[PDB]
Amino acid sequence: HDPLDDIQADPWALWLSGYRRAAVLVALTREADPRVLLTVRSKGQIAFPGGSLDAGETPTQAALREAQEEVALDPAAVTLLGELDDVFTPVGFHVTPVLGRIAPEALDTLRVTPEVAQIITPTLAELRAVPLVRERRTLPDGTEVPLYRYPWRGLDIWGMTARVLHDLLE
């Protein structure tokens, strides 16, 4: 059990960018029409493979470890491309989106562990074409903040995940 999973399911926790640390792996396939590896947690919580860093662990190590423990993605099958800006929520959670590239075929033999119900791979083009939901909420200090939702194939990608997805698409 991970605290990141609790906070991620909180409909009201706001996420933005620009003390508890975590990381998510954002794997993109090496192809003309790039897909992104996402999971549906055992409506299920849609999220990137990931979780809190253990003691002495870096964001990258956590991201790679989580993707391997969750869907059996071999770290060596991932080319690290750097990370997007950290996304965070007021309470005290910082998430580092660790970017990586995999061969499209790598997706075929992944295996879901009990924590994950299924593996979904939206194409970046599809996420871009979907009727994005753009809302806004105000933080305690008066700071406005955008909130996104990506309606894909009947599933609702919201919260921290949609926030990273949006930074990624930009």
Give the DSSP H/E element, type plus range, for residue 112: none
- Would you state the structure tokens that stand for residue 25, as one six-digit string? 């792996």
Structure tokens at 55: 């003691």
Dist. CA 13–CA 41, nearest whole Å: 19
Domains of the chain from N-terminus onward: 1-170 (3.90.79.10)
Which residues lie closer than 8 Å to 102 by C-beta, 6 or more apart?
27, 28, 29, 30, 37, 73, 77, 78, 79
HSE-up of residue 123 (Cα within 13 Å, Cβ side): 8
Binding residue per annotation — 57?
Answer: no
Do residues 64 and 25 touch, judged by C-beta distance below 8 A?
yes
Q: From which experimental method does this structure derive?
A: X-ray
Q: Tell whether 70 is in a known binding site.
A: yes
Q: Longest Cα pair distance anywhere in the chain, in angstroms?
A: 47
Cα–Cα distance measured from residue 33 to residue 147, given in angstroms and rounded to the nearest whole number? 26
Tell me the C-alpha distance between 5 and 140, whole Å: 24
